[PDB]
């Protein structure tokens, strides 16, 4: 019998900073055991500084960004071009999922940028259009590995203050651009170790209020 | 697992890859898939784990007891035909796809093993998920009289080629090398082209960020 | 596979394709289905490749010890070895053997043992997942009392319509000739049987 | 929901330093049957565009109906229809992949594995993937089937990334496929012999090269197998 | 599991309905009332899938109230039983059927007789002198089969039907949190606040 | 999935109380989700079951329940508006909606009132719910410590001991309490509270979880 | 009905500098029922330790079956048994029920007393050796101290510093699984003392 | 069914077998499966027999209608419309049909229609359950530019093959020749075909 | 369904098992003991599948009962808890397991302590100070975990047991009929006749 879906596994994450964010993916496409790309981008910059990555069945995933482009390009015409706010694009979303809630599109998506008061933000979504704004957030085939770490290191997990008897948490601080992209890129080669599906490269998506910057690093190709 | 076994001149040369899953996770990125079944006798292994090892070390013991009954050194064949018999006795449920290769009095030889227990033989043999990649190599740059040296260098390419592209298949190329009238020489990490960059930051905590209830020494003594 | 036997003037030869399948992957393509287990008794196998080589090894051992006790076998008795096994184990086997052999009293003997674990004595048989497109071929070009290069050329045109129609089959023509001269070991190539 | 009848195998393909090479053969098997042999499964569109399809045939004529009609179509008024406004690899892509995912939504997909090879206006390479499941992406080299298993691997040893297609001619290039196309002969049981070849240089625009043979095989070592490992005769 | 019971003694009908609402291996709500109002002389319990006896039930009543501010007339327990169980023959070969079984209760003031209506989710209608859904009708059936007469006073009732809830509550594996009890008379529909 | 969820009518209103862990199979997704929907300014949802389904017709009830107000120039009574959303469940009824959800609010003519909305059309008016995977130990500790006359500062800490509870036992619930208290001239968040450090500080002061070493 | 998932836990290895490391969690549950937060996972047979993940009436049977056959190998040997070779009596009782297996993931570690070399190993249920010179992971959570011990892993730590990475690695996968947690306990094991150590965790 | 088509210098012939089968019992044993559908544009039927002739009517009232307003049509035409209701409802159908036709200026000409709604041109076409046994037949003995002669044995020797091998094939043999001399039908009898 | 609690406080071990025995729509008994005595000072309280719950039981009982006549010995809670586990542990891989739960509380002598074992039908055996089996911790688990103090006298326990009691009998779906309750202490076993 015909299934409609697939897994072209890979792997993303989206960090939120004081006055920046990050959404990272690595660039490898996967069937089953074999690799359909090494260099196939899955974050993609949608305007109005928002970034965006719909991670798990790419056709699913491409069609969904796609429509998300076209509800900005909309959003304009109405509007008086007025800018599409993270929070407004994050609702937007959550329709164009829950629209298809009985034939799903098969993607955890994920959006970053900057809220109306310039702070960094960043939403996660399940397939289904449940949304949630976040610090931190990975997604896809190695999210289980990466996501504890970063409850560690991003918002100091289990980390109490040297010789306090454990009474003293670690204290909250924002982090650097330079200390998150360290993160993401240790996630990553971290990541590719250990999970078969996760590898080849690395394109990190930079969101300030200047605009949208990228940075690519290689990955193991094994 | 990628593996692969060529014929030469004057012997028989096999190699594998180091990769080990569980699932779509690395358990172990440096395993050993070549096994010793007697000196001059060795066999490379792909599909379950256990029974690879498992099948190979008690044809092994049985291959040793024989050799010391017979007062003579054993045979590939002997190996071969005691590795099919108690494959097809389990009627493929013992998951062992080997590549059985070695010299003795008789010459040198390279056969394969499937889980069912069909035998064949042949110059230049793969096995395991990379085998079509090792074999699209194989069938690319084979050649009837190969050198040590050649061989060597065509069975680490087909390894390579599984490493790269076979998602069950990475990290380093093992090879053992089995020549007539000499001992075999094991290349344990004949070529290690999967090294971890180094990291962006140490994640060295100080000492105390542990939170601790209870501390008590253990008797391991008497 | 695609596989035969024919018998012939001076006795009977065995044929067969090289090919060995994974689903639509070729693990072998270079293999040899043309087994001994006689001197001038030999087998093509069919069907599971495990299967057909366990049978093959076992028959081979039983007509070693018959011929230590009782002397050379018939090809009527290995025949009927093959059997036993293929008939009693018929739910745990995938095997379609084509028995053949020399004798000087009998000449060339062909017995053809399917699935269930049946015989069948023939002047020729075919067998194998190719032999379904050669059965209108082989019935109309067959002749009995035919000499060797008759006998070769008629197998060799069979097993090339074989391999040509049927994906299952391929790689390269191996014959076994058996006589009274001895055994004969023949090889043809895709770029001559292709282009027949 | 289907199931596919009349199939075709692997369609291979790479990018060199001026443009794409695409190649598969010309089998149309019925299951296990060789049926058809004389099936072609590269269709150019214009001067600079060629796709290369796999899967089931039936589903193969119709798309091959829909690029032919949509040459005509983008000739209606039109002047510029041979120059500025001719159809590009990336126009024809994206319509396809839009009609491949639109039928996988409906539970009606049109059974294949689509490659679609070409040169742009400005000289850039184009080469993308698409298959039933509206599934897309590209790389220097792509292939479907078995050729994704077998033919990729080889084709990587010679542009392993982007910064080696400069380094690639098209002797080269050629060469490899060329080579795949016989490794797949070796070790693919629905493969034939025959194939057919395309390049499209933005230099020397489409060269369509049909009725090709797989040649230069190994096949003499098989005299001295024997058995299958105890047999000496 | 609902418990729905009715009786029809000489003056009127009384029907007893369980409080119990239960969803997994949790018990909600103790005090749940399994009846609608349908018109002053006429009341409808019920008992089946969840929600789908409630949207039924409701559903029914503001058809028999519509009725009723058109005409201004009260229809008849049976004119009513024969609406319901038509509403339930139509839902049977739906895409989705009404999965509930009901017993109305009711007083003909014309006749000035009291009349109980079984029906099922099927549209399968039965006037009774007592009548049960579920399984509650394999444990009280030989209790009425044998006590009740026809010419009980509503008291006698009561006591009959207090008789048949010890026999659920001693032998029926659930707790069904006890019953809410009400009767249909000449005078309308009013509610027993303890038993 | 799992969660815990509770709701309970008092003297002063209504206590809100919800843990915070969403769960894919064993894999913990998130310790940060919003099982209260903010309805509006007087109307509070909670979330157990498909989150998706209960965001997006909680916030779809909103919306209706503002065009209510703009029509008839009145609040919106609790009875109406979880009527609203469940014939809207109720007409999607085996297509696979996943709801179990309490609409809470207080008004005039109603006072405190609670809802239990269900996906398969249960419509239940009631004084406590609890919903989720830990309910059974979160319904224990309400039942035996409940009281119609207790205060707005004891209510609070029962919600939030009870949720605790819940989230010990049961693995697929913990993360953090997030607590509310609905007024009649609206709800009021008292807001999010590590399970982790609630625990101990429990432990603690109140000598409960003498099994746990701490 | 998933064996390897009903009871939860997890069990984490590492090397250090001279020095060993393994760490276990304390729950024990019935799917999403906890019913023990005081259910050790590691035991050791004279200075050899083992950690079992898995189905707890398997760890437990285990563990007696490996005190049974270590006690009997000490009175014919006439002395401890070594982790290496107590690896390879674990692979293979293991293999003994390759087609009727213990449900478990164990996990050996210890440091060899003739050659002082730190040693650990992972085994599948079937008994498949995994040696590792870093690491070795097993439990409901592998996946997540998979990702913390690849990042936060370094080589020849010290004891006092490898006791922070190998607690840290645990705490965080723990949080991050719904079956595990409820408590843990590290062993520090040297040459010639071992101190065993109960972290302070989050108990939901 | 076994039905076969071959083009020859004058024109094409078809060729087809006289059993219809419900599992193993022949329901009719003297079926016409060769069937008009114009003067000159005849075709095969195989497969399930309601779908091939619901099939045959269409097509038919299809070419009447088109004739009336554009003349004669094609064979390639004849196929177009065949194919499109074979592929537009290959979920629902069961139908292998071979066109056949003969023009003026195109003379004879083959197609063939498979499960999946494909087309084929060909120089001849086989198809049926019992084609599977003569492929290797066929494509030996196929010659371009037969003679009528010869076009006629060489369909009678192969549909005789496919008839002794295929249990689901026998009867009579019917013929049908297109040529620009008109339409000539041809039958041939067991007694005479078996014993070729 | 079945239900077995347990609690073991200061100097006692209280197990609490329901007195129902449904088989199908019926309550077939509403006075069942679901326990045996294996020695003076050890209590085996058990729920599961039909048949094997007595079955299993009874030949532990004998099993016991043998060792103490062979040795003149008592065996301790902890002996008998790791006699149980194995018998289990072997169950779970035959033919046909025993799908029985079962709770061990006994006091032992040598050390002057109570002890509560809980063993499952795979042999997953835990001491505890409070146990349950079958959805039964699902309701009491949160009660105890907040009044269970461990320094608690028998009187205290049997009042924290009633309010576990009335917890299942208000929020549990069936009817289980109450419990039988005994106690284990240094002077041996005893049954509470009013509870
Ligand atoms: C390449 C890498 C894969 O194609 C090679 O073929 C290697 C061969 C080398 C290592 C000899 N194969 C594997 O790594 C092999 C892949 C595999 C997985 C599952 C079935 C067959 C083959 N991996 C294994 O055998 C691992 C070895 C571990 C990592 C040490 N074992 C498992 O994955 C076991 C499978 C055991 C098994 C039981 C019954 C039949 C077949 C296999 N699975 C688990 O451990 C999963 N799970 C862990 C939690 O506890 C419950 C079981
Ligand atoms: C032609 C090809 C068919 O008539 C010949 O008969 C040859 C005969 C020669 C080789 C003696 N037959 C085969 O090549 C034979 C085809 C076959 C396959 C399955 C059942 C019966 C016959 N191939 C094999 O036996 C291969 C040989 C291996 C690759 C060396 N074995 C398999 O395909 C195994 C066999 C398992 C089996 C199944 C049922 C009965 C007996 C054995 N199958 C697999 O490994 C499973 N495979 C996994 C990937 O997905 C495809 C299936
Ligand atoms: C040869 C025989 C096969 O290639 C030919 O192709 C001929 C073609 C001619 C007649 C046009 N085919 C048949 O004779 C054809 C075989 C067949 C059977 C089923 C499906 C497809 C093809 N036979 C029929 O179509 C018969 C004709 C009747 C007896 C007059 N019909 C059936 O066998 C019907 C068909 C129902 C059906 C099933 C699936 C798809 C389409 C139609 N079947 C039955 O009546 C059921 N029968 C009940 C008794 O048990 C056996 C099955
Ligand atoms: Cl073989
Ligand atoms: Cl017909
Ligand atoms: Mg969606
Ligand atoms: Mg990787
Ligand atoms: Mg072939
Ligand atoms: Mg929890
Ligand atoms: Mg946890
Ligand atoms: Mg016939």
């Known amino acids: 019998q015909f299934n409609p879906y697939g897994d072209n596994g890979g792997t993303i994450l989206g960090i939120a900073g004081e006055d920046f964010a990050v959404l990272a993916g690595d660039t490898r496409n996967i069937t089953d055991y074999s690799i359909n790309s090494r260099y196939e981008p899955k974050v993609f910059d949608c305007g109005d500084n928002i970034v965006m990555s719909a991670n798990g069945f790419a056709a699913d995933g491409d069609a969904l960004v796609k429509r998300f482009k076209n509800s900005v390009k909309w959003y304009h015409f109405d509007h008086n071009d007025k800018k599409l706010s993270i929070n407004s694009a994050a609702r937007n979303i959550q329709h164009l999922l829950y629209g298809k809630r009985f034939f799903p599109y098969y993607v955890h998506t994920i959006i970053a940028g900057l809220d109306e008061d310039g702070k960094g933000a960043v939403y996660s979504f399940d397939p289904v259009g449940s949304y949630e704004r976040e610090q931190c957030r990975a997604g896809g085939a190695a999210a289980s590995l990466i996501m504890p770490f970063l409850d560690n290191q991003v918002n100091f997990k289990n980390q109490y203050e040297p010789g306090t008897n454990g009474k003293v948490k670690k204290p909250l601080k924002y982090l650097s651009v330079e200390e998150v992209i360290k993160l993401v890129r240790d996630s990553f080669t971290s990541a590719t170790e250990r999970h078969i599906q996760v590898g080849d490269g690395l394109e990190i998506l930079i969101v300030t209020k200047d605009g949208v910057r990228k940075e690519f690093y290689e990955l193991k190709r094994d | 697992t990628t593996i692969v076994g060529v014929k030469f001149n004057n012997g028989v040369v096999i190699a594998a890859d180091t990769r080990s899953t569980q699932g779509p996770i690395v358990a172990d990125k440096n395993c050993a898939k070549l096994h010793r079944i007697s000196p001059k006798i060795w066999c490379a292994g792909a599909g379950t784990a256990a029974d690879t090892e498992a099948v190979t070390q008690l044809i092994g013991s049985n291959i040793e007891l024989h050799s010391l009954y017979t007062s003579r050194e054993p045979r590939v064949v002997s190996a071969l035909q005691m590795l099919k018999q108690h494959l097809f006795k389990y009627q493929g449920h013992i998951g062992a796809y080997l590549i059985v290769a070695g010299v003795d009095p008789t010459g040198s030889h390279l056969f394969s093993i499937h889980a069912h227990g069909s035998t064949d033989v042949g110059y230049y043999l793969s096995l395991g998920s990379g085998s079509l990649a090792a074999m699209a190599v194989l069938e690319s740059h084979w050649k009837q009289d190969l050198t040590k040296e050649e061989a060597i260098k065509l069975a680490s390419d087909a390894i390579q080629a599984g490493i790269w592209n076979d998602l069950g298949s990475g990290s380093n190329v093992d090879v053992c090398v089995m020549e007539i009238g000499k001992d075999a020489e094991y290349l344990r990490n004949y070529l290690t082209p999967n090294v971890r960059e180094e990291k962006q930051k140490s994640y060295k905590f100080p000492r105390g960020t542990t939170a601790v209830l209870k501390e008590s020494i253990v008797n391991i003594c008497d | 596979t695609s596989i035969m036997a024919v018998t012939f003037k001076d006795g009977v030869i065995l044929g067969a394709d090289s090919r060995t399948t994974t689903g639509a992957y070729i693990a072998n393509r270079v293999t040899d289905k043309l087994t001994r287990v006689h001197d001038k008794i030999w087998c093509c196998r069919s069907g599971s490749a495990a299967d057909t080589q366990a049978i093959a090894d076992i028959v081979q051992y039983h007509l070693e010890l018959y011929t230590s006790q009782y002397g050379t076998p018939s090809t009527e008795t290995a025949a009927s070895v093959f059997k036993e096994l293929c008939y009693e184990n018929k739910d745990n086997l995938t095997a379609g053997i084509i028995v053949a052999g020399y004798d000087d009293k009998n000449k060339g003997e062909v017995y053809t043992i399917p699935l269930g674990g049946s015989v069948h004595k023939l002047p020729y048989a075919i067998a194998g997942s190719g032999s379904t497109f050669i059965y209108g071929y082989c019935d109309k070009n067959f002749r009995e009392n035919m000499s060797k290069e008759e006998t070769v050329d008629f197998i060799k045109h069979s097993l090339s319509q074989a391999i040509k129609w049927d994906g299952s089959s391929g790689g390269v023509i191996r014959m076994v000739v058996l006589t009274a001269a001895g055994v004969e070991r023949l090889i043809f190539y895709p770029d001559e049987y292709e282009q027949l | ?233 | 599991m609902d418990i729905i019971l009715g009786i029809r003694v000489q003056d009127s009908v009384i029907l007893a309905s369980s409080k119990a609402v239960t969803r997994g291996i949790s018990v909600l709500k103790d005090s749940d009332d399994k009846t609608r109002q349908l018109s002053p002389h006429t009341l409808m319990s019920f008992a089946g899938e969840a929600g789908d006896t409630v949207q039924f039930a409701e559903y029914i009543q503001a058809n028999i109230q519509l009725y009723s501010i058109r005409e201004d007339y009260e229809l008849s327990p049976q004119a009513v039983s024969s609406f319901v169980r038509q509403e339930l023959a139509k839902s049977i070969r739906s895409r989705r059927p009404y999965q509930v079984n009901v017993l109305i209760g009711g007083y003909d003031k014309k006749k000035n007789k009291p009349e109980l209506y079984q029906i099922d989710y099927l549209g399968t209608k039965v006037e009774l002198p007592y009548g049960a859904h579920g399984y509650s009708g394999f444990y009280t059936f030989s209790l009425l089969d044998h006590h009740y007469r026809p010419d009980m006073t509503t008291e006698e009732g009561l006591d009959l039907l207090k008789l048949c809830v010890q026999e659920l509550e001693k032998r029926m594996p659930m707790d069904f949190k006890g019953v809410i009890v009400k009767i249909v008379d000449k005078d309308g529909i009013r509610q027993v606040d303890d038993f | 999935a799992g969660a815990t969820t509770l709701a309970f009518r008092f003297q002063g209103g209504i206590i809100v109380a919800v843990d915070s862990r969403a769960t894919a199979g064993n894999w913990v997704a998130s310790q940060t989700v919003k099982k209260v929907i903010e309805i509006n300014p007087f109307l509070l949802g909670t979330m157990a079951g498909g989150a998706a389904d209960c965001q997006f017709w909680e916030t779809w009830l909103g919306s209706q329940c503002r065009l209510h107000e703009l029509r008839e120039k009145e609040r919106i009574s609790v009875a109406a508006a979880s009527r609203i959303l469940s014939n809207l469940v109720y007409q999607y009824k085996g297509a696979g909606l996943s709801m179990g959800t309490m609409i809470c609010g207080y008004t005039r003519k109603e006072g405190p009132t609670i809802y239990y909305v269900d996906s398969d059309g249960t419509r239940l008016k009631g004084d406590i719910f609890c919903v989720g995977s830990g309910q059974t130990f979160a319904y224990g500790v309400l039942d035996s410590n409940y009281k119609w006359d207790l205060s707005v500062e004891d209510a609070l800490y029962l919600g939030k001991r009870s949720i605790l509870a819940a989230a010990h036992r049961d693995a697929y619930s913990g993360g953090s309490v997030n607590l509310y208290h609905v007024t009649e001239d609206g709800w009021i968040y008292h807001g999010n509270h590590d399970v982790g450090e609630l625990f101990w500080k429990v432990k603690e002061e109140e000598g409960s979880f003498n099994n746990v070493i701490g | 009905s998933d064996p390897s998932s009903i009871n939860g836990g997890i069990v984490v290895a590492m090397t250090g500098k001279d020095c060993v490391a393994i760490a276990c969690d304390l729950r024990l549950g019935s799917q999403s029922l906890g019913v023990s937060n005081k259910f050790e996972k590691i035991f050791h047979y004279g200075h050899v330790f083992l950690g079992i993940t898995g189905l707890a009436t398997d760890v437990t049977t285990l563990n007696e079956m490996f005190r049974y056959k270590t006690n009997l190998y000490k009175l014919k040997e006439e002395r401890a048994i070594e982790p290496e070779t107590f690896t390879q009596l674990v692979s293979s009782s293991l293999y003994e029920r390759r087609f009727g297996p213990y449900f478990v993931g164990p996990v050996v570690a210890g440091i060899n007393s003739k050659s002082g070399k730190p040693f650990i190993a992972g085994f599948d249920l079937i008994g498949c050796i995994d040696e590792a010179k870093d690491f070795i992971v097993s439990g409901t959570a592998s996946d997540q101290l998979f990702g913390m011990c690849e990042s936060l892993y370094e080589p020849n730590l010290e004891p006092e510093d490898l006791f922070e990475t190998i607690s840290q690695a645990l705490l965080n996968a723990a949080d991050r699984d719904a079956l595990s947690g409820w408590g843990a306990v590290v062993y520090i094991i040297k040459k010639d003392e071992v101190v065993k150590r109960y972290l302070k965790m989050r108990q939901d």
Do not use: C
């Open chain 4, 1 to 233: 929901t289907q199931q596919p009848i009349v199939t075709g195998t692997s369609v291979i393909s790479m990018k060199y330093d001026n443009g794409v090479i695409i190649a598969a053969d010309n089998l149309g098997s019925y299951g296990s049957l060789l049926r058809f042999n004389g099936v072609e499964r590269l269709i150019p569109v214009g001067d600079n565009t060629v796709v290369g399809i796999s899967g089931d045939i039936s589903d193969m004529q119709h798309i091959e109906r829909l690029l032919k009609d949509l040459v005509t179509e983008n000739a209606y008024d039109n002047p510029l229809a041979d120059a500025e406004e001719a159809l590009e690899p990336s126009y024809i892509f994206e319509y396809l992949a839009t009609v491949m995912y639109q039928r996988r939504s409906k539970m009606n997909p049109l059974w294949n594995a689509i490659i679609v090879a070409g040169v742009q206006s400005n000289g850039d390479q184009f080469l993308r993937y698409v298959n039933l499941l509206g599934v897309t992406y590209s790389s220097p080299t792509l292939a479907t089937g078995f050729g994704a298993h077998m033919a990729n691997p080889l084709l990587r040893k010679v542009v392993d990334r982007e910064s080696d297609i400069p380094k690639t001619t098209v002797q080269v290039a050629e060469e490899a496929i060329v080579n795949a196309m016989r490794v797949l002969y070796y070790r693919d049981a629905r493969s034939s012999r025959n194939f057919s070849l395309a390049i499209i240089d933005k230099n020397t625009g489409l060269t369509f090269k049909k009725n090709l043979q797989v040649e230069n095989m190994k096949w003499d070592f098989a005299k001295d197998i024997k058995g299958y490992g105890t047999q000496k005769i």
